Symmetry: C4
Subunit: 29 residues, 4 copies
């Protein structure tokens, strides 16, 4: 359960990094 | 407290999902 | 340290909610 | 593992800070 947490925190950071570099913006452009 | 945290991680992942797929840009574009 | 973690996770969610409802977008508009 | 997690929380807060204050919109607007 501790690892699942670690890993979901990395996932959150990965999802952020992707947000930063957006479906609706990519489409608009 | 561990399960509380695990729930918050899931709310955080759902929220990023909603962001991925924005209030002001949806408003801008009529969506 | 466990509470600091709880609280920083709420903070992250609060920062997300605000992002969702952006400095540069608010300015552009 | 606890400190690893605490570090990730901080990288996550810094990242949200950078987001708050976007690659494609910065590009759009010349910034």
């Amino acid at each position: 359960r501790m690892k699942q947490i670690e890993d979901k925190l990395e996932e959150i950071l990965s999802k952020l990094y992707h947000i930063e570099n957006x479906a609706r913006i990519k489409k608009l452009l």
